[PDB]
Amino acid sequence: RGGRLCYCRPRFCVCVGR
């Protein structure tokens, strides 16, 4: 696909993929 970024870490965390 174009890009799927999804993850979550107590240091930083965000989900986005489109």
From Swiss-Prot:
Domain of life the protein comes from: Eukaryota
Cysteine disulfide links: C6-C15, C8-C13
Subcellular location: Secreted
Modified sites of kind Arginine amide: R18
Function comment: Microbicidal activity.
Family label: Belongs to the cathelicidin family.
Name the UniProt record assigns to this protein: Protegrin-5
Organism: Sus scrofa (Pig)
Gene: NPG5
Included stretch of the parent chain: 131 to 148 of 149
